[PDB]
Enzyme design. Structure first.
Site, PDB file in Angstrom:
ATOM      1  N   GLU A  34       0.782  -1.235   0.000  1.00 52.67           N
ATOM      2  CA  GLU A  34       0.000   0.000   0.000  1.00 52.67           C
ATOM      3  C   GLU A  34       0.815   1.286   0.000  1.00 52.67           C
ATOM      4  O   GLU A  34       0.337   2.311   0.506  1.00 52.67           O
ATOM      5  CB  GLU A  34      -0.930   0.063   1.205  1.00 52.67           C
ATOM      6  CG  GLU A  34      -2.305  -0.374   0.926  1.00 52.67           C
ATOM      7  CD  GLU A  34      -2.481  -1.813   1.208  1.00 52.67           C
ATOM      8  OE1 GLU A  34      -2.139  -2.632   0.331  1.00 52.67           O
ATOM      9  OE2 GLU A  34      -2.944  -2.123   2.319  1.00 52.67           O
ATOM     10  N   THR A  39      -0.023   1.765  -8.376  1.00 56.17           N
ATOM     11  CA  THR A  39      -0.573   3.008  -8.928  1.00 56.17           C
ATOM     12  C   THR A  39       0.421   3.641  -9.884  1.00 56.17           C
ATOM     13  O   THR A  39       0.041   4.038 -10.989  1.00 56.17           O
ATOM     14  CB  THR A  39      -0.985   3.961  -7.783  1.00 56.17           C
ATOM     15  OG1 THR A  39      -1.818   3.228  -6.878  1.00 56.17           O
ATOM     16  CG2 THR A  39      -1.765   5.178  -8.301  1.00 56.17           C
ATOM     17  N   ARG A 169      -7.739  -1.419  -6.143  1.00 59.86           N
ATOM     18  CA  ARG A 169      -6.758  -2.293  -5.498  1.00 59.86           C
ATOM     19  C   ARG A 169      -7.105  -3.760  -5.755  1.00 59.86           C
ATOM     20  O   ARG A 169      -8.130  -4.235  -5.285  1.00 59.86           O
ATOM     21  CB  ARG A 169      -6.779  -2.050  -3.990  1.00 59.86           C
ATOM     22  CG  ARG A 169      -5.680  -1.165  -3.467  1.00 59.86           C
ATOM     23  CD  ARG A 169      -5.203  -1.697  -2.121  1.00 59.86           C
ATOM     24  NE  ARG A 169      -4.560  -2.994  -2.314  1.00 59.86           N
ATOM     25  CZ  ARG A 169      -4.436  -3.946  -1.392  1.00 59.86           C
ATOM     26  NH1 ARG A 169      -4.918  -3.775  -0.167  1.00 59.86           N
ATOM     27  NH2 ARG A 169      -3.810  -5.076  -1.705  1.00 59.86           N
ATOM     28  N   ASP A 191       7.584  -4.347 -10.520  1.00 60.90           N
ATOM     29  CA  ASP A 191       7.133  -4.343  -9.146  1.00 60.90           C
ATOM     30  C   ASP A 191       7.030  -5.832  -8.841  1.00 60.90           C
ATOM     31  O   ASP A 191       6.358  -6.570  -9.569  1.00 60.90           O
ATOM     32  CB  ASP A 191       5.766  -3.627  -9.128  1.00 60.90           C
ATOM     33  CG  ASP A 191       5.006  -3.771  -7.821  1.00 60.90           C
ATOM     34  OD1 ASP A 191       5.584  -4.197  -6.788  1.00 60.90           O
ATOM     35  OD2 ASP A 191       3.796  -3.437  -7.840  1.00 60.90           O
ATOM     36  N   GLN A 195       4.798 -11.510  -3.528  1.00 59.88           N
ATOM     37  CA  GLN A 195       5.934 -12.403  -3.496  1.00 59.88           C
ATOM     38  C   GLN A 195       6.051 -12.936  -2.086  1.00 59.88           C
ATOM     39  O   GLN A 195       6.640 -12.280  -1.227  1.00 59.88           O
ATOM     40  CB  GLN A 195       7.216 -11.654  -3.916  1.00 59.88           C
ATOM     41  CG  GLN A 195       8.451 -12.540  -4.084  1.00 59.88           C
ATOM     42  CD  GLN A 195       8.124 -13.893  -4.716  1.00 59.88           C
ATOM     43  OE1 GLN A 195       8.142 -14.932  -4.034  1.00 59.88           O
ATOM     44  NE2 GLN A 195       7.813 -13.892  -6.014  1.00 59.88           N
TER      45      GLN A 195
HETATM   46  N1  LIG Z   1      -5.159   9.377  -2.135  1.00 60.39           N
HETATM   47  C1  LIG Z   1      -4.133   8.664  -2.594  1.00 60.39           C
HETATM   48  N2  LIG Z   1      -4.269   7.348  -2.793  1.00 60.39           N
HETATM   49  C2  LIG Z   1      -3.120   6.774  -3.258  1.00 60.39           C
HETATM   50  C3  LIG Z   1      -1.914   7.378  -3.536  1.00 60.39           C
HETATM   51  N3  LIG Z   1      -1.005   6.440  -4.008  1.00 60.39           N
HETATM   52  C4  LIG Z   1      -1.690   5.344  -3.984  1.00 60.39           C
HETATM   53  N4  LIG Z   1      -2.974   5.461  -3.556  1.00 60.39           N
HETATM   54  C5  LIG Z   1      -3.998   4.449  -3.278  1.00 60.39           C
HETATM   55  O1  LIG Z   1      -3.600   3.674  -2.129  1.00 60.39           O
HETATM   56  C6  LIG Z   1      -3.870   2.307  -2.365  1.00 60.39           C
HETATM   57  C7  LIG Z   1      -2.585   1.407  -2.355  1.00 60.39           C
HETATM   58  O2  LIG Z   1      -1.677   1.753  -3.428  1.00 60.39           O
HETATM   59  P1  LIG Z   1      -1.068   0.620  -4.415  1.00 60.39           P
HETATM   60  O3  LIG Z   1      -0.412   1.240  -5.554  1.00 60.39           O
HETATM   61  O4  LIG Z   1      -1.971  -0.522  -4.603  1.00 60.39           O
HETATM   62  O5  LIG Z   1       0.062   0.149  -3.338  1.00 60.39           O
HETATM   63  P2  LIG Z   1       1.127  -1.039  -3.565  1.00 60.39           P
HETATM   64  O6  LIG Z   1       0.568  -1.996  -2.508  1.00 60.39           O
HETATM   65  O7  LIG Z   1       2.397  -0.442  -3.096  1.00 60.39           O
HETATM   66  O8  LIG Z   1       1.010  -1.576  -4.912  1.00 60.39           O
HETATM   67  C8  LIG Z   1      -4.641   2.285  -3.695  1.00 60.39           C
HETATM   68  O9  LIG Z   1      -6.051   2.277  -3.472  1.00 60.39           O
HETATM   69  C9  LIG Z   1      -4.160   3.508  -4.404  1.00 60.39           C
HETATM   70  O10 LIG Z   1      -5.062   3.908  -5.409  1.00 60.39           O
HETATM   71  C10 LIG Z   1      -1.778   8.785  -3.325  1.00 60.39           C
HETATM   72  O11 LIG Z   1      -0.801   9.513  -3.498  1.00 60.39           O
HETATM   73  N5  LIG Z   1      -2.959   9.351  -2.835  1.00 60.39           N
END
Ligand SMILES: Nc1nc2c(ncn2[C@@H]2O[C@H](COP(=O)(O)OP(=O)(O)O)[C@@H](O)[C@H]2O)c(=O)[nH]1
Lengths: 338, 58, 339
Positions: A34, A39, A169, A191, A195
């Site tokens: 997260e 994203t 997500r 990414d 894993q």
């Molecule tokens: N408001 C907001 N939501 C974000 C931001 N970056 C990511 N998200 C949201 O936070 C959640 C987790 O991000 P994701 O990219 O799935 O995280 P990962 O687990 O690192 O792949 C998702 O619902 C995204 O859309 C940001 O800068 N602002």
């Protein structure tokens, strides 16, 4: 010879791949769950690959409905765990019904009866008070986003927008890679995703990447791990960075820090004291001071012999223009350094 | 659950293994040795290979 | 208490396993083989250097004809070579380039591979030339694919970083059996010659014997200090060898349920990545992080030779079925055949 000729054929193709690989920039995305990695990958598609097709957006409806239901149930279950009373008693019956439906309806669907209950719940003051106390339980980042616009999501003819897609997500396993052209060069961004294994056994696979983009969710400063409600999410993220930055396979690797979710952070910093994360913090709990403090905490973990600078950027991964801008800055330094 | 259940299954595997009917090392070893000795004399990596029978010669 | 009483019963059952182990430990292999003449200094020469991969090679597997072999590199290619002529038979572009393993089907009809994509992909060789047809993608693991081995054209066993191994029905893409028990990423596996049992090595520093039909763990072997990165069945199916990060290889006997010998040297300090016995089983060859392959006298535990030639880690190796050659794969992008 036929075989010899065929071998020569394959070799001329292999020769191309080598030339192409020579002009390719490899970017490894890392960061806790997260933090914003998926994203960033979606943004590369939107910004450098002509976005999503109609059918692709439509495929996201089920995910968006899943996310939306998941979000409301989390708030609902927290009503009991936090001992928060509903604004209107009638909402109790709605909650009871919603929970029965939740494990009755097909995954990814949103019946009119469900959305009706959800919109009623969303409007309740108890629910709103519970929602504001999200730090105390585990709630999706997009909870408010989808729940506040639920009517649109269920209106017939509804087609997910890029922002709707970006806010989604999905649970997946395996490494995810995106490839594209930009600035007359080839890019490969990956990414590792789901894993489930020990990093030490696979981290060496990335020795030699052009650069590492490390994502940190600024707003995690008062949250805890779902699996371990004793582990502060930011402390966990710091351990991850410490481990990666000082790893033997990345002694001279270009590392860039994306201090992500600055939008959520900006709002949260007015509510939660940074001291929740850093007890010793004596600065002012402002977006400026506090964000700079977090930045310093991560940068100070760098004990590398090669003192090459680790660039930092305050980002909002869900904001396409912000990402497009930061990525443009990032790529310039990379090209003019590697 | 989890911790206890992984462990409950750990102890559950040991109980099975503890009933293992083990053979004598020497018997095992001797049978190991005899196996190798019967064929090491024809092992290309032990003896080397006459160039004319070597498929990896230039 | 519940947990503690479990921690207790487990340890008690363990100190009970060793005693049983000692009870059968009347002698040692080196004693039994002391009257055997040394193999002397084993001196193999590089007979071929297979050049074609653009990056680190992570795996390889010999075809049962002892001529064709396939190699996997993170350049995203699976190449099938004619080791005799050095001619490239195929150069398959993989969907995911983060491959960690590859296998050659005994029939020679298919190859398989996988890696950080957590999938085991099957390719049909008896179809396309140069590239080839991806015939199946076996999804189910939640950690990387570390090793895979075909039992036949429709069955394949796989090991994963998610701490489990699995048996798959290829035509169905279904997992017919799952092997649970290891408490660390499973790094390697080897099938018994009769394919009715198999052994796996893991990061929990243990090896386990598994029944393929009954899906349960028969035996667990301990002794190593660190992760076991490689494992291989001995020709008579009564023992197998392991290679570990602890700079040692070990020989374990199934019937005695314990190790018969450790292969090491004070000057060899790096980790082992692969292991393999020569045809008779007299020699145990292993690949090391220090760029060499060390040849060991399996019966006497003597370091009989070294295969130096690679300029980076030797990541994998294999001895042909006819026993005529050993191939080594390396992070230096090359494979070499030694004789
Ligand atoms: N408001 C907001 N939501 C974000 C931001 N970056 C990511 N998200 C949201 O936070 C959640 C987790 O991000 P994701 O990219 O799935 O995280 P990962 O687990 O690192 O792949 C998702 O619902 C995204 O859309 C940001 O800068 N602002």
């Amino acid at each position: 010879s036929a075989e010899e000729k065929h071998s020569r054929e394959l070799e001329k193709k292999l020769k191309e791949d080598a030339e192409k690989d020579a002009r390719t920039v490899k970017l490894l995305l890392l960061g806790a769950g997260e933090s914003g990695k998926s994203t960033i990958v979606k943004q590369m598609k939107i910004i450098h690959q002509d976005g999503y097709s109609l059918e692709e957006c439509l495929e996201f409806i089920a995910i968006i409905y899943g996310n939306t239901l998941q979000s409301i149930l989390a708030i609902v279950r927290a009503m009991t765990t936090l001992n928060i009373q509903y604004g209107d008693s009638a909402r109790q019956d709605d909650a009871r019904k919603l929970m029965h439906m939740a494990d009755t309806i097909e995954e990814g669907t949103m019946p009119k009866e469900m959305s009706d209950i959800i919109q009623r719940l969303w409007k309740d003051s108890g629910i709103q008070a519970c929602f504001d106390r999200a730090s105390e339980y585990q709630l999706n980042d997009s909870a408010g986003y989808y729940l506040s616009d639920l009517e649109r999501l269920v209106t017939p003819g509804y087609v997910p927008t890029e922002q709707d897609v970006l806010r989604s997500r999905v649970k997946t396993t395996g490494i995810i890679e995106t490839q594209f052209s930009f600035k007359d060069l080839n890019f490969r961004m990956f990414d590792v995703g789901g894993q489930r294994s020990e990093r030490k056994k696979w981290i060496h696979c990335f020795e030699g990447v052009t650069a590492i983009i490390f994502c940190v969710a600024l707003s995690d400063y008062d949250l805890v791990l779902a699996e371990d409600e004793e582990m502060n999410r930011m402390h966990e993220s710091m351990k991850l960075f410490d481990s990666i930055c000082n790893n033997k396979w990345f002694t001279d690797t270009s590392i860039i820090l994306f201090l992500n979710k600055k939008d959520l952070f900006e709002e949260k910093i007015k509510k939660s004291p940074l001291t929740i994360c850093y007890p010793e913090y004596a600065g002012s709990n402002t977006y400026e001071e506090a964000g700079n403090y977090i930045k310093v905490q991560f940068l100070e973990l760098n004990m590398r012999r090669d003192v090459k600078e680790i660039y930092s950027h305050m980002t909002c991964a869900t904001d396409t223009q912000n990402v497009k801008f930061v990525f443009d800055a990032v790529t310039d330094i990379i090209i003019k350094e590697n | 659950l989890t911790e206890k259940d992984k462990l409950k299954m750990e102890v559950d595997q040991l109980k099975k293994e503890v009933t293992l009917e083990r053979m004598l090392v020497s018997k095992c070893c001797e049978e190991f040795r005899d196996y190798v000795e019967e064929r090491s004399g024809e092992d290309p990596l032990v003896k080397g290979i006459p160039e004319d029978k070597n498929p990896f010669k230039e | 208490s519940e947990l503690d009483q479990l921690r207790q019963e487990a340890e008690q059952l363990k100190n009970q396993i060793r005693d049983a182990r000692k009870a059968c430990a009347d002698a040692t292999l080196s004693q039994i083989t002391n009257n055997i003449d040394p193999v002397g200094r084993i001196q193999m020469r590089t007979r071929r250097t297979l050049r074609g991969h653009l990056a680190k090679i992570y795996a390889m597997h010999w075809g049962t004809d002892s001529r064709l072999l396939l190699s996997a590199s993170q350049d995203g290619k699976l190449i099938i070579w004619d080791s005799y002529t050095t001619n490239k038979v195929h150069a398959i572009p993989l969907r995911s380039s983060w491959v960690m393993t590859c296998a050659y089907a005994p029939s020679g009809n298919y190859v398989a591979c996988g890696g950080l994509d957590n999938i085991c992909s099957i390719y049909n060789l008896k179809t396309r030339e140069g590239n080839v047809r991806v015939s199946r993608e076996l999804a189910g693991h939640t950690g990387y694919l570390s090793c895979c081995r075909f039992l036949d054209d429709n069955q394949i066993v796989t090991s994963s970083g998610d701490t489990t191994c699995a048996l798959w029905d290829i035509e169905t893409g279904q997992q017919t059996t799952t092997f649970t028990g290891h408490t660390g990423d499973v790094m390697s596996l080897s099938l018994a010659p009769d394919t009715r049992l198999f052994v796996s090595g893991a990061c929990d520093a243990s090896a386990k014997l598994w029944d393929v039909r009954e899906g349960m763990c028969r035996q667990t072997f301990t002794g190593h200090e660190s992760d076991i990165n490689a494992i291989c069945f001995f020709p008579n199916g009564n023992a197998f060898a392991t290679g570990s990060d602890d700079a040692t290889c070990r020989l374990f006997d199934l019937r005695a349920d314990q190790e018969l010998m450790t292969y090491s040297h004070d000057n060899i300090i790096c980790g082992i990545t692969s292991v393999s016995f020569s045809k008779s089983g007299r020699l145990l060859l292993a690949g090391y992080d220090d760029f060499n392959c060390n040849v060991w006298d399996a019966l006497k535990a003597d370091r009989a030779g070294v295969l130096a030639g690679h300029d980076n880690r030797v990541s994998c190796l294999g001895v042909t079925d006819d026993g005529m050659a050993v191939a080594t794969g390396s992070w230096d992008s090359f494979l070499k055949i030694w004789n």
